[PDB]
UniProtKB/Swiss-Prot annotation:
Taxonomic lineage: Viruses, Duplodnaviria, Heunggongvirae, Uroviricota, Caudoviricetes
Active site (UniProt): E11 (proton donor/acceptor), D20 (proton donor/acceptor)
Superkingdom of origin organism: Viruses
Source species of the chain: Enterobacteria phage T4
GO biological process: cell wall macromolecule catabolic process; defense response to bacterium; peptidoglycan catabolic process; viral release from host cell by cytolysis
Effect on the protein of changing T26E: Complete loss of activity at neutral pH; covalently bound substrate
Biological role stated in the UniProt entry: Endolysin with lysozyme activity that degrades host peptidoglycans and participates with the holin and spanin proteins in the sequential events which lead to the programmed host cell lysis releasing the mature viral particles. Once the holin has permeabilized the host cell membrane, the endolysin can reach the periplasm and break down the peptidoglycan layer.
Name of the molecule in the record: Endolysin
Subcellular location: Host cytoplasm
Gene from which this protein is expressed: E
Keywords associated with the record: Antimicrobial, Bacteriolytic enzyme, Cytolysis, Glycosidase, Host cell lysis by virus, Host cytoplasm, Hydrolase, Viral release from host cell
SUPFAM superfamilies noted in UniProt: Lysozyme-like
Family: Belongs to the glycosyl hydrolase 24 family.
Triggers of expression: Expressed late in the viral replication.
């Protein structure tokens, strides 16, 4: 199991523009296009991301390309984030993947604000961080997915994804 498979499980794969859990225009494997309510705005963003007139649809390969880019960006985001970097560096390989998944889902900025959880994670206080992570809008809105990420931090194994 790895970060790619993990997120592929959590996000799914859709080849046609769609609205995410927040009602935002997305496509592929969790690739947010725009927060604008305009389907045209999204179609435009889409065409610009892919480099062609897509008409709201893309191929599996294009979806995968966006996904790789997105994963790469999340890692780079973490590495360049002063609050995130140190946490990441302190963790083992399974847990690093869980932090990447959180950043992928909610952005570098969103994660950087879980100050208390981040500190618990750095201190290797697993159960406590797990409890703290659950007191969030994130968990309340997408509980099944959040539980999977949280169990990953708690246990340091991929059991939740198996
Ligand atoms: Cl892009
Ligand atoms: Cl969910």
């Amino acid at each position: 199991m790895n970060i790619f498979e993990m997120l592929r499980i959590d996000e799914g794969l859709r080849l046609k523009i769609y609205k995410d859990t927040e009602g935002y225009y997305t496509i592929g494997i969790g690739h947010l296009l725009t927060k604008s309510p305009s389907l045209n705005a999204a179609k435009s963003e889409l065409d610009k991301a892919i480099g062609r007139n897509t008409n709201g649809v893309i191929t599996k390969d294009e979806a995968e390309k966006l996904f790789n880019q997105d994963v790469d960006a999340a890692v780079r985001g973490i590495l360049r984030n002063a609050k995130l970097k140190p946490v990441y560096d302190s963790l083992d390989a399974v847990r690093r993947a869980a932090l990447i998944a959180m950043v992928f889902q909610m952005g570098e900025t969103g994660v950087a604000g879980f100050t208390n959880s981040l500190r618990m994670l750095q201190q290797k206080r697993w159960d406590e961080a797990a409890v703290n992570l659950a007191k969030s809008r994130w968990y309340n809105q997408t509980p099944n997915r959040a539980k999977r990420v949280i169990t990953t931090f708690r246990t340091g194994t991929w059991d939740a994804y198996k």
